[PDB]
C-alpha cells in the first residue's frame, strides 16, 4: 500500500489550492476514511479533514469553509482543494487513509503561498582541495544556489552515495531566494578515480542537474 | 497544535526517557491517547494506539500510557536511530482529531570537535558575477558552535548564514555550514579569506583560510 502525493509547490494568494493523493496497492472504495494533514514549517500537526466509506465529509472547523474533498474511484485518487488561501496555509501537506490500527501516510507535499514567483537554482561544484582535506579525509559537495520556493533535493551517485552525506536546510538570502549546500566525506586516495555527481531536483521550476564535482588545482 | 509537549528532552544511548503530553478533560480526558514519531524528512509514524497499545513492528521499548488529562510515551533502550520528533495525539470534544506541538529527542553522546573545510568560490560562480565562499564544520558535538568571518582580517558582521543538519542517526554529531557571500568585484579586492571556528571540543579556536588566487 502506497500513497503518493501530487500538487503545485507554489500557489498566489487568493487563488486555491489543489492536491491529490494517488493510492496504489488498494482500492479507493475499500478505505475507511482518506484524509489531509499537515504542518506548517517548524511546527506540529494539524488536521485538515478526512471522507469516510459512505462519502460523509469532516473538516477542521476552522477551515471548513473553504476545504473540499473527494475521492475519484476511476484515478483510484482522492483529492483536496482548498481555496482563498494566504501566507497562512504554506505547510506541509500529507494525505493519510486506514486500510483494512495503523493508517498509511502520504511522503508530504511542501506547498508555498506566496505572491514571489518561480525560479530555478544554479548548481555549483564545492571542490575538494587541501583546504577540505583533513587527514586521509576530503570533504566536497555542491552549493544550490538562488532558488524558490522550496523544496530542492539532493542525492550523490544516483544515491549510491549515501554515507557521509549531509544536505543542510536551505537558508533564506536577503534577496528572497533560497540557497543550500550538500557535501560527502570521501576517502583523499578517491578523488581521482571516482567520479562525483550531485543530482539535483528543484520540481517546482523542472529544474533537474547532475553536476560533476572534481578536485581543484591550487 | 492544542496539545501542550515539552520542546525537549534528552538523554545518552542505552537509558530511559519519557515525553508528556497534557490536554483538557474534554480531549485527553475522554478519548485515547496515540503517539507519532516523525524522523526528519519523513512522515509520522504511529508507536502507540489506545493509550498503551503497540502496532505490528513497534519493539516493546516504547510504551505509553495515560493518567487524568496527562499522557506519557516511555522510550527505553535508547539508539541513536531514535532521534527524532515525537507528537501526541487525541480526539477532541467533536471527536476531530488534535495533535501536540511535538517534542524534540536529542541523544547525549560524547564531546566531539568539529572537522573544519572551506571553499572558495568556483569559477562558474564567479563568471556570473557574484561569490560565495563556505565553511563547514563536521560532526561535532555538542550542536553550540561559533563560526567568524574574517576578510583580509576585517571581521564579517550579517553579512553571512549558516544552517545545521538535524542530529546524525550513527553517531549523534551535527554539522554546520556557513556561506559569505560577496559579489565578484568586491570578492577582488581582497586576498586572505578565512574561517575562525570556536567549539567545546577545540582547546583553542580552529582557522582555515585561503588566499583570493592560489586556486
Known amino acids: 500500500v502506497q500513497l503518493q502525493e501530487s500538487g503545485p509547490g507554489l500557489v498566489k494568494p487568493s487563488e486555491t489550492l489543489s492536491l491529490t493523493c494517488a493510492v496504489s496497492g488498494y482500492s479507493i472504495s475499500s478505505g475507511y476514511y482518506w484524509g489531509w494533514i499537515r504542518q506548517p514549517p517548524g511546527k506540529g500537526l494539524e488536521w485538515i479533514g478526512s471522507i469516510y466509506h459512505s462519502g460523509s465529509t469532516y473538516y477542521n472547523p476552522s477551515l471548513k469553509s473553504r476545504v473540499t474533498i473527494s475521492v475519484d474511484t476511476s484515478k483510484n485518487q482522492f483529492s483536496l482543494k482548498l481555496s482563498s488561501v494566504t501566507a497562512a496555509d504554506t505547510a506541509v501537506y500529507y494525505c493519510?487513509?486506514?486500510?483494512?490500527?495503523?493508517?498509511?501516510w502520504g511522503q508530504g507535499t511542501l506547498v508555498t503561498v506566496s505572491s514571489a514567483s518561480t525560479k530555478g537554482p544554479s548548481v555549483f561544484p564545492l571542490a575538494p582541495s587541501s583546504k577540505s582535506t583533513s587527514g586521509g579525509t576530503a570533504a566536497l559537495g555542491c552549493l544550490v544556489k538562488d532558488y524558490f520556493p522550496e523544496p530542492v533535493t539532493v542525492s550523490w551517485n544516483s544515491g549510491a552515495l549515501t554515507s557521509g552525506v549531509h544536505t543542510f536546510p536551505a537558508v533564506l538570502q536577503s534577496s528572497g531566494l533560497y540557497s543550500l549546500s550538500s557535501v560527502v566525506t570521501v576517502p583523499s586516495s578517491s578523488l581521482g578515480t571516482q567520479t562525483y555527481i550531485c543530482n539535483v531536483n528543484h520540481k517546482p521550476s523542472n529544474t533537474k542537474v547532475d553536476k560533476k564535482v572534481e578536485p581543484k588545482s591550487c | 497544535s492544542v496539545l501542550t509537549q515539552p520542546p525537549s528532552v534528552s538523554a545518552a544511548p542505552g537509558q530511559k526517557v519519557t515525553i508528556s503530553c497534557s490536554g483538557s478533560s474534554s480531549n485527553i480526558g475522554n478519548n485515547y491517547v496515540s503517539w507519532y514519531q516523525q524522523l526528519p524528512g519523513t512522515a509520522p509514524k504511529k508507536l502507540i494506539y489506545?493509550?498503551?497499545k503497540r502496532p505490528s513492528g513497534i519493539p516493546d521499548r516504547f510504551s505509553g500510557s495515560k493518567s487524568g488529562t496527562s499522557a506519557t510515551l516511555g522510550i527505553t533502550g535508547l539508539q541513536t536511530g531514535d532521534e527524532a520528533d515525537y507528537y501526541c495525539?487525541?480526539?477532541?470534544?467533536?471527536?476531530?482529531?488534535?495533535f501536540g506541538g511535538g517534542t524534540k529527542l536529542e541523544i547525549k553522546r560524547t564531546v566531539a570537535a568539529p572537522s573544519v573545510f572551506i571553499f572558495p568560490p568556483s569559477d562558474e560562480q564567479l563568471k556570473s558575477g557574484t561569490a560565495s565562499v563556505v565553511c563547514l564544520l563536521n560532526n561535532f558535538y555538542p550542536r553550540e558552535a561559533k563560526v567568524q568571518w574574517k576578510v583580509d582580517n576585517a571581521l564579517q558582521s550579517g553579512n553571512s548564514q549558516e544552517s545545521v543538519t538535524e542530529q546524525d542517526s550513527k553517531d549523534s554529531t551535527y554539522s554546520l555550514s556557513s556561506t559569505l557571500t560577496l559579489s565578484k568585484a568586491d570578492y577582488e579586492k581582497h586576498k586572505v579569506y578565512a574561517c575562525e571556528v570556536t567549539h567545546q571540543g577545540l582547546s583553542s579556536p580552529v582557522t582555515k583560510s585561503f588566499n583570493r588566487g592560489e586556486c
Open positions: 489506545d493509550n498503551n
Open positions: 493519510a487513509g486506514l486500510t483494512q490500527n495503523d493508517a498509511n
Open positions: 495525539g487525541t480526539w477532541d470534544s467533536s471527536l476531530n482529531p488534535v
